[PDB]
Ligand binder design. Structure first.
Ligand SMILES: CC(=O)N1c2cccc(O)c2NC2=C(C(=O)CC(C)(C)C2)[C@@H]1c1ccc(Cl)cc1Cl
Ligand SMILES: [Mg+2]
Length: 557
């Protein structure tokens, strides 16, 4: 069976779509080579359609059967709980797609009579109708990138109506936030903050007698997900104690929505049909994470890998284990890939055995080493800064509803590029405009958070600890990568950023209060006569690294 069938209707935009980066004074002082930055659009959608459309062989074996049964068994341990409409509503981010049926995201969060009446009716419908496919929209995605020495086609979101998305939360938020950890325990990626993730990868690695590690990338995880997979994923949810309306809701949502369904474009036209995973549902992150864990664990047994530890974030997989020598590790990996391929999880690039942890790239990121204030070697998470920087330049020239620079500052607070460039740049900009006290939207692990940047000292301390304000003496690889990247992009050199930082730092300090605190902590690296950094009393919220809600419709004020 095919991943998608197409009518011929085009994937259509609905606002103006912009591909080229603007030539803006502020972003130009962050990034010069402005032609290199682009945003994907609806014009390349038909390219992605050909990539994402293919037939899917799947052969299941006894290993796959057995992991499944271990998984279900851990799931029957869990008890889930219905959200009230009010709770489900207050989870909806204010810039969600409006409904076909009048009301929009504001009307949901404000509980207007129209929206709630439609939601109630959609809920009633989900309990009463078992079979009618639920319609979805298919839109291209605008995401910015830096060019290749070619250019990526847009990715495609597939999401059901707002009224439906609220109902998903009512019947599944508590499941999707709770069951993945119950099943995979320490393997569940999204329970970890960056610090925590490094702790885990370092521990695991150093506990191995002779460690080998690899990450595995599968072609199009969403299109490779067959309806069988989506059923298995249901059968796991159904091991929970669930109120009877939720059980019935999960049953209808699976049949009607998740297993596949009709696709409409922006203009209302019949577009095609879906038989794999929808990228824009509340169960996409959790479902993927589960399908993935399951297939990888079976393949590990098939491939006879020894002492496998693995960490899973949706479709992103990393595995550390006992080396048996280069030949047989290569051969084991070949077996693992072939086992995975039978499970309808074929690999993009063939996975590569790796004998040093710093060389393992996983969720775009790797561990690196630096030194804290004491001089102790300290491991932290980093990535290549090219894409983060492009999006920073783009979010500078254009107002956008998610600020990836703010997610990158918070996630990569202890990186060289985050500290010298990112912070320096945006505090300068915000300070210019007096918008410092003002709140901004960004996202961690798919869920959307509102954040005042002035609270960055306190947030960083709680996630990373004061160490992040004093890491120094970075590795040469990291410095080289960062530096080669700044030249590629025409981003001014770190030298320049230090000079700028000194000026931001001085100006914040004059402001006093919370701003002066940003100045002392964030920029203590810019001065030689350094300030002593004790904890911030104020820095003493909960669900920040619980689960991953990518594609869900999730918000936190
Ligand atoms: C989809 C998703 O939420 N993640 C993800 C997963 C895999 C690759 C990847 O690049 C990302 N990216 C990001 C993520 C952010 O939190 C925001 C931000 C800005 C750090 C980017 C996030 C992520 C980043 C680093 C790691 Cl180690 C894991 C994850 Cl899930
Ligand atoms: Mg992939």
């Amino acid at each position: 069976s095919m991943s998608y069938t197409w009518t011929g209707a085009l994937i259509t935009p609905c606002a103006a779509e912009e591909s080229k980066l603007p030539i803006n004074p502020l972003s130009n002082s962050l990034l010069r080579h402005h032609n290199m930055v682009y945003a994907t659009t609806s014009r390349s959608a038909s390219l992605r359609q050909k990539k994402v459309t293919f037939d899917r062989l799947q052969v299941l074996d006894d290993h796959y059967r057995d992991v499944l049964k271990e998984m279900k068994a851990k799931a029957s341990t869990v008890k889930a709980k219905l959200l009230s409409i009010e709770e489900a509503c207050k989870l909806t981010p204010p810039h969600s797609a409006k409904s076909k049926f009048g009301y929009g995201a504001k009307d949901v969060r404000n509980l207007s009579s129209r929206a709630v009446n439609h939601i109630r009716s959609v809920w009633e419908d989900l309990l009463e109708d078992t079979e009618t496919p639920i319609d979805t929209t298919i839109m291209a995605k605008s995401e910015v990138f830096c060019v290749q020495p070619g250019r990526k086609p847009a990715r495609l979101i597939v999401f059901p109506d707002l009224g439906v998305r609220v109902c998903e939360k009512m019947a599944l938020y508590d499941v999707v936030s709770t069951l993945p950890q119950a099943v995979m325990g320490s393997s569940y990626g999204f329970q970890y903050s960056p610090k925590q993730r490094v702790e885990f990868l370092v521990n695991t690695w150093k506990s191995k007698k002779c460690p080998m590690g690899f990450s595995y990338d599968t072609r199009c995880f969403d299109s490779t997900v067959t309806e069988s997979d989506i059923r298995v994923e249901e059968s796991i949810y159904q091991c929970c104690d669930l109120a009877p309306e939720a059980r019935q809701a999960i049953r209808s949502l699976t049949e009607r929505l998740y297993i596949g369904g009709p696709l409409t474009n922006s203009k209302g036209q019949n577009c095609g049909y879906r038989r794999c995973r929808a990228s824009g549902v509340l169960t996409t992150s959790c479902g993927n994470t589960l399908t993935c864990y399951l297939k990888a664990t079976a393949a590990c047994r098939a491939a006879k890998l020894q002492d496998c530890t693995m960490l899973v974030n949706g479709d992103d997989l990393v595995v550390i284990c006992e080396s048996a020598g280069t030949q047989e590790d290569a051969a084991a990996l070949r077996a693992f890939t072939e086992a995975m391929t039978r499970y309808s999880a074929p690999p993009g690039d063939p996975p590569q055995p790796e004998y040093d942890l710093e060389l393992i790239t996983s969720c775009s990121s790797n561990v690196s080493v630096a030194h804290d204030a004491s001089g102790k070697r300290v491991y932290y998470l980093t990535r290549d800064p090219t894409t983060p920087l492009a999006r920073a330049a783009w979010e500078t020239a254009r107002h956008t509803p998610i600020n990836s620079w703010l997610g990158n500052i918070i996630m990569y607070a202890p990186t060289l590029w985050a500290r010298m460039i990112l912070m320096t740049h945006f505090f300068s900009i915000l300070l210019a405009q007096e918008q410092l006290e003002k709140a901004l939207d960004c996202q961690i692990y798919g869920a959307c958070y509102s954040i005042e940047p002035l609270d960055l000292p306190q947030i960083i301390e709680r996630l990373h600890g004061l160490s992040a304000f004093t890491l120094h003496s970075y590795s040469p690889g990291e410095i080289n990568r960062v530096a080669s990247c700044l030249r590629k992009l025409g981003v001014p050199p770190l030298r320049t950023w230090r000079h700028r930082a000194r000026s931001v730092r001085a100006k914040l300090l004059s402001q006093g209060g919370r701003a002066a605190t940003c100045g002392r902590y964030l920029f203590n690296w810019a001065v030689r006569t350094k300030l002593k950094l004790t904890p911030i009393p104020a820095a003493s919220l909960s669900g920040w690294f619980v689960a991953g809600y990518s594609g869900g419709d999730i918000y936190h004020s």
